[PDB]
Design a protein around this nucleic acid. Structure first.
Lengths: 48, 138, 94, 109, 193
RNA sequence: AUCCUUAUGCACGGGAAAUACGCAUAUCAGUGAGGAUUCGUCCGAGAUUGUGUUUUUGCUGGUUUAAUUAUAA
């Protein structure tokens, strides 16, 4: 799928990722949201 | 219904809206022979006590007192409106009319998340509350 | 809700009352075309009519003297046990 | 019973020693974070659930341990290790002894 | 007198409707007979409406004519309620009218097996000896299979962490837990709902 | 005179839990609360009901420059 989309760069051109202006992406990690979300669930929260 | 108190006068109206200090004000404008103005009357009938801390519910028939019709632009059988410290609370539902309310909410839990969410917003003074739920297609 | 008990009016129009903010002849023949227009032109209740009638014999003492209600399903107990037991969660050990 | 009031409160922050050990339960571990971090540009490690569905454990192994499939020993928190409720505890132990005397009645006979 | 009593009257409309949701026969003294009759007839009406409505929605959900949403949700409840009701019925009448086998039939059946096994030369299963080489080499298997609901989960709810506790203890002090088993087999005939 | 025992109280050191604990003019409850089984028996003190808190109780912790005033004219 990646290659058939024209290789990574041609994707990232679809992103903001140049905005963060890392030169190359090769050192980076994402942050799963599920972590943040859960880490906010152990608190005490109204259904809303 | 019996739980829900009602309004007989524009005087009742604006006194109420003024005279509830610390909590939201909820008012149904609808005509007893409407369908929804029964249904929604039920939905709110079941939430009355459970919210009574931070809000309060009142029923008003347009046919009783039609005064506000001109000024608040009342069409539809049933429009709920929310007032907190005399200000018209505005929570965009994505429905396309941010002011007031129209349609029927089919879940208690939802409805509570609304009355609450708006409330919490109105305690900060933000004019816009952003609904939890975009029901727009209605 | 004392002003539901009071319920006076005053001389005032509601709008300024709060300081509110918004955020025969032609009609005659019109009526002619109205009544003209329509000129060309429950079961439930019926059921219960017998019983609501047969209550005719019910003394107002029994109306006064009647139980009010109960809970047979124990809605409270089990309910509060649920909304108890779920109160918290935890983290799944490593 | 009426829902209390939506309004948030200023956080009381009291962190003892005791109170901390009582926290370590509810707050994500370290490892449990080294899951969450999804290495950019490169497919996760995932494993197969009971259901075979893949649970991504993203960074939970430093990339040196992916090449060797070294899994992890790293740190295992004994703080959040799950433990019985009070009641259940005595039903357990109780039943255990009871069954054990029944047994020993098969021990001597 | 009315209004005050009117409200409560509404209640027994509810507690009626629930107590039919529960099958409970719902008897109160001091409830004047005619009213109680009324309630009955009412519940019959709302009942039939509710049931027919549930099945009505259902098949639609199978076809997919737009069901809104809360119908998809509540439907499962307002339905399963029934399937329980049907079950409770079938078993009432399997008390009253007694088992449906009749012994004659049973004789053929049981015979069939017995002949089969003899023909098959088959020894029954021994109750596990208190020393059984596979005991450990078994428990682990069974214990893991109560484990793996969880192996994804980040957040154990309450009832869970209770289980996962047990699974770990028995998974720790086996000889004790085995003894607990063997007793349970040899005696326990009563169980929690 | 010395020691042990028992219970209770004040303590000191140390650990453990904070789905635990309360509270109640409630209601009952050795004049049986509740349970068990090998069906012969055995066990023998709280249960119910309502209610409140329960990621907590009190406290304490670290990051988003004063006024006064002096010349020879």
């Amino acid at each position: 799928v990646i290659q058939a989309l024209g290789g990574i760069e041609t994707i990232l051109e679809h992103t903001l990722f140049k905005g963060t202006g890392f030169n190359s992406w090769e050192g980076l990690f994402w942050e799963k949201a599920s972590g943040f979300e859960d880490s906010m669930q152990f608190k005490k929260l109204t259904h809303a | 219904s019996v739980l829900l108190p009602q309004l007989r006068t524009g005087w009742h109206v604006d006194q109420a809206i003024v005279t509830e200090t610390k909590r939201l004000v909820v008012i149904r404008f609808g005509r007893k022979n409407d369908r929804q103005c029964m249904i929604m009357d039920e939905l709110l009938s079941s939430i009355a006590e459970r919210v009574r801390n931070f809000a309060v519910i009142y029923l008003c028939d347009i046919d009783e007192v039609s005064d506000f019709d001109e000024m608040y632009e009342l069409t539809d059988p049933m429009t709920v409106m929310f007032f907190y410290h005399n200000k018209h609370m505005m929570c965009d539902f994505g429905t396309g009319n941010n002011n007031k309310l129209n349609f029927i909410v089919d879940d208690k839990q939802e409805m509570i998340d609304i009355l609450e969410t708006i409330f919490r917003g109105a305690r900060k003074n933000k004019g816009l509350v952003v609904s939890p739920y975009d029901y727009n297609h209605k | 809700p004392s002003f539901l008990d009071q319920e006076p009016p005053a001389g005032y129009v509601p709008g300024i009352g709060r300081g509110a903010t918004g955020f025969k002849t032609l009609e005659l023949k019109l009526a002619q075309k109205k009544k003209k227009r329509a000129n060309e032109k429950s079961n439930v209740k019926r059921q219960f009519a017998d019983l609501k009638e047969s209550l005719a014999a019910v003394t107002e003492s029994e109306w006064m003297d009647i139980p009010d209600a109960t809970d047979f399903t124990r809605r409270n107990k089990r309910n509060r046990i649920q909304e108890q037991l779920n109160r918290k969660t935890y983290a799944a050990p490593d | 019973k009426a829902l209390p009031i939506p309004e948030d409160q200023p956080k009381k922050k009291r962190a003892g020693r005791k109170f901390r050990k009582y926290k370590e339960k509810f707050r994500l571990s370290h490892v449990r974070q080294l899951q969450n971090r999804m290495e950019f540009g490169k497919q996760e490690q995932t494993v197969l659930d009971s259901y075979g569905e893949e649970v991504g454990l993203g960074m939970s192994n430093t990339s040196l341990q992916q090449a060797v499939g070294a899994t992890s020993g790293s740190r295992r928190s004994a703080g959040n290790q799950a433990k019985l409720t009070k009641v259940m505890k005595h039903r357990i132990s109780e039943a255990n002894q009871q069954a054990d005397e029944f047994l020993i009645s098969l021990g001597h006979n | 007198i009315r209004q005050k009593k009117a409200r409560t009257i509404l209640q027994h409309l509810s507690e009626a409707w629930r107590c039919w949701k529960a099958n409970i026969p719902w008897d109160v003294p001091g409830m004047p007979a005619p009213i109680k009759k009324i309630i009955e007839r009412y519940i019959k009406s709302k009942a039939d409406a509710w049931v027919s409505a549930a099945h009505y929605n259902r098949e639609r959900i199978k076809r997919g004519a737009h069901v809104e949403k809360t119908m998809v949700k509540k439907n499962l409840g307002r339905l399963t309620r029934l399937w329980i009701k049907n079950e409770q019925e079938r078993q009432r009448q399997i008390q009253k009218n007694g088992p449906e086998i009749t012994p004659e039939e049973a004789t053929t059946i049981f015979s069939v097996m017995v002949e089969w096994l003899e023909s098959r030369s088959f020894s029954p299963i021994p109750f596990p000896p208190l020393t059984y080489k596979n005991d450990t080499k078994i428990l682990v298997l069974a214990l893991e299979d109560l484990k793996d609901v969880y192996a994804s989960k980040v957040r154990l709810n309450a009832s869970e962490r209770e289980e996962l506790a047990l699974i770990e203890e028995a998974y720790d002090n086996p000889h004790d837990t085995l003894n607990r088993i063997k007793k349970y087999l040899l005696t326990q005939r009563v169980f929690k709902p």
